[PDB]
Amino acid sequence: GSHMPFVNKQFNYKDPVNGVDIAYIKIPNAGQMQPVKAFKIHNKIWVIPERDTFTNPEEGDLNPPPEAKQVPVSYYDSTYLSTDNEKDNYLKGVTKLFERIYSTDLGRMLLTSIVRGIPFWGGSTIDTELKVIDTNSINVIQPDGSYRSEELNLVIIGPSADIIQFECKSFGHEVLNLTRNGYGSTQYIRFSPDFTFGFEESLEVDTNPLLGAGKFATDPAVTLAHELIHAGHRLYGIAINPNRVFKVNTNAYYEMSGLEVSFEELRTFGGHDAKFIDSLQENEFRLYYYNKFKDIASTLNKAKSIVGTTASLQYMKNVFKEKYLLSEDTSGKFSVDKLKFDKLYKMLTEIYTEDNFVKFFKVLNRKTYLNFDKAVFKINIVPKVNYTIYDGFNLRNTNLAANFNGQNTEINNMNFTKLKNFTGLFEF
Amino acid sequence: XARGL
Ligand SMILES: [Zn+2]
Numbered sequence A: 001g002s003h004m005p006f007v008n009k010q011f012n013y014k015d016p017v018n019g020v021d022i023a024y025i026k027i028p029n030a031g032q033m034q035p036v037k038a039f040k041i042h043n044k045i046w047v048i049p050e051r052d053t054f055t056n057p058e059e060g061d062l063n064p065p066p067e068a069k070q071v072p073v074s075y076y077d078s079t080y081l082s083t084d085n086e087k088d089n090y091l092k093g094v095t096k097l098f099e100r101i102y103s104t105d106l107g108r109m110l111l112t113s114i115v116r117g118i119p120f121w122g123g124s125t126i127d128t129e130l131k132v133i134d135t136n137s138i139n140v141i142q143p144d145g146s147y148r149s150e151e152l153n154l155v156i157i158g159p160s161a162d163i164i165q166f167e168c169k170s171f172g173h174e175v176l177n178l179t180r181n182g183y184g185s186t187q188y189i190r191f192s193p194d195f196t197f198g199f200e201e202s203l204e205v206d207t208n209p210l211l212g213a214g215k216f217a218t219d220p221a222v223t224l225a226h227e228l229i230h231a232g233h234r235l236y237g238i239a240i241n242p243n244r245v246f247k248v249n250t251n252a253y254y255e256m257s258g259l260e261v262s263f264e265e266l267r268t269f270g271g272h273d274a275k276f277i278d279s280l281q282e283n284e285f286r287l288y289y290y291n292k293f294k295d296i297a298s299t300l301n302k303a304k305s306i307v308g309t310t311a312s313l314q315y316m317k318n319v320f321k322e323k324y325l326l327s328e329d330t331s332g333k334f335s336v337d338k339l340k341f342d343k344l345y346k347m348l349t350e351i352y353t354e355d356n357f358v359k360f361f362k363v364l365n366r367k368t369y370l371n372f373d374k375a376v377f378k379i380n381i382v383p384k385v386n387y388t389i390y391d392g393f394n395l396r397n398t399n400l401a402a403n404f405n406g407q408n409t410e411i412n413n414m415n416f417t418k419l420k421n422f423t424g425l426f427e428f
Numbered sequence B: 001x002a003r004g005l
Helices: A084-103 A105-115 A220-236 A252-256 A263-269 A271-276 A279-302 A313-324 A338-351 A354-361
Strands: A022-026 A036-042 A045-048 A137-141 A147-151 A154-157 A187-190 A195-199 A245-247 A260-262 A375-378 A417-421
Touching: A036 A084, A084 A105, A084 A220, A105 A220, A105 A338, A105 A354, A154 A220, A187 A220, A195 A220, A220 A263, A220 A338, A220 A354, A245 A263, A260 A263, A263 A271, A263 A354, A271 A354, A279 A313, A279 A338
Parallel strands: A045 A154, A154 A187
Antiparallel strands: A022 A036, A022 A137, A036 A045, A137 A147, A195 A375, A245 A260, A375 A417
């Protein structure tokens, strides 16, 4: 469903800020930062082609740590994203990759949820008062120079010191049950079109730490989509806590090292990885989020009070009605229909998954979340001659159309530059 | 954030 494109504008980084879709802006609870030039590429969704020194206090220096410090699966370049055509490339890449996602029926579905996925207005200490949470906002510099507060859902931002960072260390005392309480909060995705990962086409090698160089290339659109499915659990508040984890007995090598994997990661991947979330336990999650919804439904029915935007009590009321699929009765009251809850739930946690996105994209991809990366490559998907919205790297009317030759790296070698090999380097 | 190892 890309008949009308997701980004309707041709964007280049150098364009004069208008204070609307191209504006210096500031993110919440950084009062420090110099305003940053950002771009609104679609309603509720913004893009910040700078590397992220902001959101988290801990990083904020892109300098590489000592080499005795660094783990093999880390990669550091302090100069990346520093120039203009670079940030120009970034906008162009991120844009395409959305359009790609958006031309699949799955992508169209998903993205619609993400737009509709507005963070609940929970800010008030007063239970009968409707209050938007201000962490859910950005602050944008209007053409006059005055600040305007603007509510959003998603931000695509450049990386941090570690470009390939495969896990977050970031989040701890941040008060965000917003992701597990059904509220949702505005998600911040760190992402680079300009890099992607090597992997092996055979299961026995791919799940082996000691074997292979990464013959094939992950399609960044599969990568972006993945964070977007994460983002969707975390906009609706149905995300699973990171400390729920699977101690891995499915792999000798993982198990040897006591590596654990968060249920949220297994769910996000989907496929045959989802049975490793215990059906027993999963129903517990279900009932929880189903009850979490009954709380949002209640809170909605109590509230006679708002904090004025232009918006009335009943306009926003219907916005969250739509978001959670609520059932109103003759008396004007909201409830949670147990059918539509499971509808919504099945959709986010099951229908939208990395596995299925691989189905739509007609691409080669890692068969399981539990596997061992081989390489990281530098890429450029901006030239149409490298990469397209419809065919990705495997380009129709070329020798790369068939047998996944576009992702084939010894064939398309023109299109990739290896940076690191992770093989053998793993902690074993 | 995450892709994992
Ligand atoms: Zn993930």
